[PDB]
Design a protein around this ligand. Structure first.
Ligand code: SF4
Length: 85
């Protein structure tokens, strides 16, 4: 269920991050960051992605240093880094 403080695909911060809510429609494949292959890359397994951030819902969690807002686990951004990679 979408929080009010959802990071929208079209968020200004999202744009800066080249975030997508749905990683299967991210440029992640083009970016092909190291860690794991692009299709496995999403906020779900992003290095400093936090469940602990409060406000976090069903699909929605705290990204790294994305204050106030919550990203969708299924999403991705240019900063994506594996949990220990
Ligand atoms: S840094 Fe990670 S958790 Fe945050 S938006 Fe990017 S991929 Fe998602």
């Amino acid at each position: 269920s979408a929080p009010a403080n959802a990071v929208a695909a079209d968020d200004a911060t999202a744009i800066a991050l080249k975030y997508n809510q749905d990683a299967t429609k991210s440029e992640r494949v083009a970016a092909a960051r190291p860690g794991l292959p692009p299709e496995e890359q999403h906020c779900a397994n992003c290095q400093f992605m936090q469940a602990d951030a409060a406000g976090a819902t069903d699909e929605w969690k705290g990204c790294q240093l994305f204050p106030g807002k919550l990203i969708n686990v299924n999403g991705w951004c240019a900063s994506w880094t594996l949990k220990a990679g």
